[PDB]
Structures are given as C-alpha cells and as structure tokens.
Amino acid sequence: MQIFVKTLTGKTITLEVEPSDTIENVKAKIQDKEGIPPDQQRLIFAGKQLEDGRTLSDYNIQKESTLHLVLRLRGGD
Amino acid sequence: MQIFVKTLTGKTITLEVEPSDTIENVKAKIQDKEGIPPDQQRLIFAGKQLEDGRTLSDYNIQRESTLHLVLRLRGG
Amino acid sequence: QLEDLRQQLQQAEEALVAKQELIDKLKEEAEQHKIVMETVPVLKAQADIYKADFQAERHAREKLVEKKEYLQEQLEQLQREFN
Amino acid sequence: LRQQLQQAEEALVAKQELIDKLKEEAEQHKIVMETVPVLKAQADIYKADFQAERHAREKLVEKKEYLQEQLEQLQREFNKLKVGCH
C-alpha cells in the first residue's frame, strides 16, 4: 500500500509500504528517499509517536493513511 | 426519501437518503447496516456502475428507485 | 339470414375474447422477461469486476515474485561474504 | 347489424397486429434471457481463478516472510562477528 509522510513545513513524500512493515523500516525508507537519519525522525499518527518496534498493522495504519514527520532537535542522539 | 439496494442473491434492504446524497455516502449507509466495506461496493443503476462523487440526483435516482449491489473480491 | 349473421357475430365475440385474453397472457410474460433482463447488465458488471480482481491479484503476486527472488539472490551474497 | 360486424373485423385485425408485435418482441427477449445462466457460470469461473490466484499469492507470502526473518538472523552473524575482529 501507499502512505503519505507530511511535515508541518509543508513537504509531502509518498511511500510504498506494506501493513506488515515496522516503523523502523519506514524511517529507513524515508532516509533512502530523502536522505534523513532515522535516529532523528519522530513519526506521528493518531497523535502518537511511532516506535521502531511496532508495525503499521498495530497502529491500524491502512492504505493511503497520512503520517507526520517531526525531526528532533538533539541530533546528539 | 427512500430507496432500495438489491443483491443478485435477491436480498433487498432500504436506505433513507436525500437526493443530494453522494454515492460515497450511500455506500457508507450500506456499511453501517450490512457491515460491507465501501471499497468493495459497486452500485449499479440503469446498467451503469455509479461513481463516488456524483450524487443520486446526478444519475437521477428518485424515491423507491432500485439500485443494484455487487461486491469486489479483493477490495483495495 | 338472421341465425347466419348471428352465428357470424358470435364467432367474433370469442374471437376478440380469444385475442384479448391472449394479449393479456403475453403481457404478463413480457413483465416476467423484463424482470430477468434487468439482471443481465448486473451479471455482466459482476463478470468484469471478478475479472479485474483477478488481474490485480495476479499483478500483485507477480511483483511479490520479483521481490522474493531478489531477496533470495541477495541472501546468496550474505553467506558468500560471510565466510 | 352490418355496421356491428365491420367494427368487429377491423378491430380483430389490428388486435392481431398487436399480438404479432408482442411475439416478435418476446423472441428478442428470449435471446437475451438465454444468456443469464451463462453469465453466472462465467462469474463463478472467474471467481475461482481469483481464489486460486489468491492461495498462490498467500503461500508465496510465507516463502518470503521466512527469508526476511532468516536474512535478518543471518545478518546478526555477519554483523556481530565482523565487529569482533577489528
């Protein structure tokens, strides 16, 4: 299925994923498509931050769902 | 106003709709009482599959008009 | 000459009662036909939908085939470099 | 009485012209109706192919999900070992 990762800034990136993929996988797909470190990516769906462990399935994130990306300021890790 | 939604099985239910209601809505009124997902629904009227955006009024569906339902197997 | 025309008319009473009754018999059938004929556009639509659903599954699978032979051929290189 | 006949003649005539219209119309119908059972058959056939295409896809999913977990565990070996050498 396809999802949309939008930023408050306004940018929108579409992704090709599967309801079995792990939030970790995605933060990695975003890096490949936008060259952005996953250790800096916070994903938001239904007002909650997504953990690299769970999967879209757990968060009932269906096809064409919209996700948000907020980058952490630390970077220190 | 009131309309009918029929399956080829013969089953016939009724929905309370407004002439300005979209196909998208009607599908959602079918999920509420039949539990059928809207993305697996295909509604037919006058030998034509109907489109989500158009309204009943657009295809000119009056009261007690009979629409036909057919379901997908995959449903995207 | 009376019974003649009289009999020639009584052969028209039933004559029209025969066709009217018949005509009525045929209208009741044209109605049963129209009921069944409304099904056709619906059944044809069903065929296409099951057809399109078939293709989607095929395509969907066909790609899962090319991503599984790419995941297996790459695993060939995770063992190679490994040792 | 003669005028009473002529009105039964011209009347029965066209009344026949109407019966011949409902019959040549019924033949058009029958030809269309003779297709209903075939259309159902077709529906089932296609449905079947689908299901078949589904099990083939469903099974071809386990075959793949087994390589992932596998390639993953077999990645820990290639990862956890190389780091130990340096």
From Swiss-Prot, chain B:
Sites bearing ADP-ribosylglycine, chain numbering: G76
Cross-link named Glycyl lysine isopeptide (Lys-Gly) (interchain with G-Cter in ubiquitin), sites: K6, K11, K27, K29, K33, K48, R63
Posttranslational mods: Phosphorylated at Ser-65 by PINK1 during mitophagy. Phosphorylated ubiquitin specifically binds and activates parkin (PRKN), triggering mitophagy. Phosphorylation does not affect E1-mediated E2 charging of ubiquitin but affects discharging of E2 enzymes to form polyubiquitin chains. It also affects deubiquitination by deubiquitinase enzymes such as USP30. Mono-ADP-ribosylated at the C-terminus by PARP9, a component of the PPAR9-DTX3L complex. ADP-ribosylation requires processing by E1 and E2 enzymes and prevents ubiquitin conjugation to substrates such as histones.
Chain positions of site Essential for function: H68
Residue ranges of domain Ubiquitin-like in the record: 1-76
Residues with PTM (Microbial infection) ADP-ribosylthreonine: T66
Cysteine disulfide partners in this protein: none
Designated name of the protein: Ubiquitin
Source organism phylogeny: Eukaryota, Metazoa, Chordata, Craniata, Vertebrata
Gene: UBA52
UniProtKB/Swiss-Prot annotation, chain D:
Effect of K59R: Slight decrease in TRAF6-induced polyubiquitination. Important decrease in TRAF6-induced polyubiquitination
Spans annotated as Leucine-zipper: 60-81
Localization, UniProt: Cytoplasm; Nucleus
Effect the entry attributes to changing E62A: Abolishes linear polyubiquitin-binding
Covalent link location (Glycyl lysine isopeptide (Lys-Gly) (interchain with G-Cter in SUMO)): K15, K47
Residue ranges, annotated region (Self-association): 1-86
Ubiquitin-binding (UBAN), as annotated region: 1-86
Location of the region described as Linear polyubiquitin-binding, does not bind to 'Lys-63'-linked polyubiquitin in the Swiss-Prot/TrEMBL record: 1-84
Outcome reported for the amino acid change (mutating K23R): Slight decrease in TRAF6-induced polyubiquitination
Transmembrane annotation, as ranges: none
PTM per Swiss-Prot/TrEMBL: Polyubiquitinated on Lys-23 via 'Lys-63'-linked ubiquitin; the ubiquitination is mediated downstream of NOD2 and RIPK2 and probably plays a role in signaling by facilitating interactions with ubiquitin domain-containing proteins and activates the NF-kappa-B pathway. Polyubiquitinated on Lys-23 and Lys-47 through 'Lys-63'-linked ubiquitin; the ubiquitination is mediated by BCL10, MALT1 and TRAF6 and probably plays a role in signaling by facilitating interactions with ubiquitin domain-containing proteins and activates the NF-kappa-B pathway. Neddylated by TRIM40, resulting in stabilization of NFKBIA and down-regulation of NF-kappa-B activity.
Result, substituting V38A: Abolishes linear polyubiquitin-binding, impairs 'Lys-63'-linked polyubiquitin-binding and impairs NF-kappa-B activation
Effect of E65A: Abolishes linear polyubiquitin-binding
Function recorded in the entry: Regulatory subunit of the IKK core complex which phosphorylates inhibitors of NF-kappa-B thus leading to the dissociation of the inhibitor/NF-kappa-B complex and ultimately the degradation of the inhibitor. Its binding to scaffolding polyubiquitin plays a key role in IKK activation by multiple signaling receptor pathways. Can recognize and bind both 'Lys-63'-linked and linear polyubiquitin upon cell stimulation, with a much highr affinity for linear polyubiquitin. Could be implicated in NF-kappa-B-mediated protection from cytokine toxicity. Essential for viral activation of IRF3.
Domain notes for this protein: The leucine-zipper domain and the CCHC NOA-type zinc-fingers constitute the UBAN region and are essential for polyubiquitin binding and for the activation of IRF3.
Assembly behavior: Homodimer; disulfide-linked. Component of the I-kappa-B-kinase (IKK) core complex consisting of CHUK, IKBKB and IKBKG; probably four alpha/CHUK-beta/IKBKB dimers are associated with four gamma/IKBKG subunits. The IKK core complex seems to associate with regulatory or adapter proteins to form a IKK-signalosome holo-complex. The IKK complex associates with TERF2IP/RAP1, leading to promote IKK-mediated phosphorylation of RELA/p65. Part of a complex composed of NCOA2, NCOA3, CHUK/IKKA, IKBKB, IKBKG and CREBBP. Interacts with COPS3, CYLD, NALP2, TRPC4AP and PIDD1.
Name of this chain's protein: NF-kappa-B essential modulator
Native source species: Mus musculus (Mouse)
